Each structure stands twice: as structure tokens, then as C-alpha cells.
């Protein structure tokens with residue numbers, strides 16, 4: 480087939496843990512003594528706009544946490560949010576290796592502040608050339624438009640690209656715009672499937 484010219488990488492659940500998923504929020508909420516039902520409902524409402532970069536973290540925190548007096552600060556809270564991010568060593572290592580031979584980019588959903596913390600903390604920029612992130616672009620996976628935008632920014636044809644994501648819905652959406660895609664289950668599996676596409 481066409482030679483692959485670019486890889487697009489999901490970050491959460493692939494390169495790193497998710498930044499602010501259900502399980503993590505549950506944990507952090509407990510630590511801060513938050514009413515979990517109210518917190519979850521408020522997060523549900525506000526999260527998408529944070530993810531799309533149309534509301535600030537301060538704004539989100541105002542609605543989701545600091546809507547009543549608290550015995551801690553937004554800075555305190557933000558610190559603990561940031562700390563939820565941990566590496567996925569084997570996949571990271573694979574990506575770092577491949578980055579020596581291929582042009583690669585992120586295509587991921589994440590609020591700006593957590594995104595930038597994750598990039599700097601884990602040196603994602605050493606192997607990803609650009610970060611096509613929801614909070615920067617104002618669209619989010621699994622919107623077909625996000626995939627198309629990534630392709631447009633990288634200037635590669637759909638068939639010359641491969642999307643790596645842990646969610647089947649995202650893999651399928653990528654394929655629907657003409658991209659190759661592989662669902663990331665584990666490093667060994669991902670390496671083999673990429674190799675099948677000529678990405679070694």
C-alpha cells in the first residue's frame with residue numbers, strides 16, 4: 480500500500496494514563512471531601528467546554544468545585560489533578576523509538592493546562608512534532624472533522640497516515656475519513672500491527 484508518512488497518537492490511555500477520567504476524578508473528589516454526586520453532575524456539564532478550550536480551568540473549577548467555601552485552594556486542587564498523569568512505560572518507549580524514524584503528531588482530547596503539564600513532564604515533544612489537541616483546535620475526537628483537521632495540518636493524505644487510539648470508536652472514525660488506524664491494547668501488539676503497515 481502507500482508508504483505511511485505520518486503517525487497520529489492519542490495520549491491518554493496510550494502514551495500516558497488518562498488525565499482526568501472517571502476513576503481519577505472519583506479518587507481526587509474523595510481526597511478533597513467533595514459531594515461526589517454534585518461534583519460529577521457539575522463536571523459533566525462543564526467538561527466539554529474546558530476540553531475544547533472555550534472555558535478556562537479557573538472557570539471550570541469555579542463551577543465544579545469552588546461553588547461553595549472550601550478549606551483548600553484552586554492551586555491545591557490543580558496540583559492533585561496534574562498528579563493523576565502517569566506514564567505507560569512500554570508504549571512510551573515504543574513511541575520514542577519510532578519517533579527517530581517517523582514524523583509523528585498527537586491527536587488528542589485534553590484541556591490546555593493538563594495537556595501542557597503532561598507534555599512537559601513526560602517529554603512528549605521529544606518525539607511528537609506537533610500537538611493537535613482539542614483545547615487548541617476547538618474540535619474533539621471522535622468528530623470526523625478532528626481527524627480531517629489533523630491531516631490538513633500535517634499535509635498528508637488519509638492513506639498515508641495512521642491513527643493510534645485506545646478506543647474503538649476513535650479508530651473507526653479515523654478509518655471512516657480514510658486513515659489507517661490501530662487500536663492500542665499493548666506495546667507488543669501495537670508494534671506488530673504498525674510493522675504490518677510498514678512502520679518499523
Ligand code: NA
Nearest residue numbers: 489491492645
Ligand atoms: Na484515549
